[PDB]
Amino acid sequence: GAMAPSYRVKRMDIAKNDEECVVNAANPRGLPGDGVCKAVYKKWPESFKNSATPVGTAKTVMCGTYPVIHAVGPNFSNYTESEGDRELAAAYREVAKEVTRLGVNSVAIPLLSTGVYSGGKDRLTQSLNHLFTAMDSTDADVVIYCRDKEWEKKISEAIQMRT
Numbered sequence: 001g002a003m004a005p006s007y008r009v010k011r012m013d014i015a016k017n018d019e020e021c022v023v024n025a026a027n028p029r030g031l032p033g034d035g036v037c038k039a040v041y042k043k044w045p046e047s048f049k050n051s052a053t054p055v056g057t058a059k060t061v062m063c064g065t066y067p068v069i070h071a072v073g074p075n076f077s078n079y080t081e082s083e084g085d086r087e088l089a090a091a092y093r094e095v096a097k098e099v100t101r102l103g104v105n106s107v108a109i110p111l112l113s114t115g116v117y118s119g120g121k122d123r124l125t126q127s128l129n130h131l132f133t134a135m136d137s138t139d140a141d142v143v144i145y146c147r148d149k150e151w152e153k154k155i156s157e158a159i160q161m162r163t
């Protein structure tokens with residue numbers, strides 16, 4: 001575990017992370033994809049061997065000794081708000097199980113279902129609150145990665161609010 005488990009947020013490419021493992025915002029088929037998934041495929045292509053997994057689950061594949069946790073959030077274009085909310089919560093619970101099993105002291109994590117799976121809605125708060133519900137009982141240092149300057153400020157505010 002980390003000495004004093006924390007949450008942080010950085011605005012940069014998660015492929016440049018300084019953590020002991022990474023969470024990919026994966027598709028269910030283990031395809032290279034777009035956004036985070038494309039950056040992760042470029043950086044860790046070996047981790048896409050047999051990475052296909054259903055919605056609401058996470059599957060870890062090693063790139064050398066570096067763990068890539070493929071977490072499949074729902075595409076809100078296809079799911080109802082209710083069913084999508086349940087699957088998005090479940091994906092993060094499976095990430096917390098993997099992070100714990102791996103025994104890492106730190107993890108880099110994107111906000112699942114906030115980009116091309118958002119069904120064109122702002123899901124910062126919904127996705128971040130499911131991340132906290134899952135990760136709060138873990139003792140890894142969590143570093144959240146985002147692209148957008150306004151999102152960085154809002155995520156930083158949400159973290160600071162609860163400290």
Ligand SMILES: Cc1ccc(N)nc1
Nearest residue numbers: 013014036039146147
């Ligand atoms: C949110 C986001 C988008 C791309 C990337 N490489 N990391 C994080």
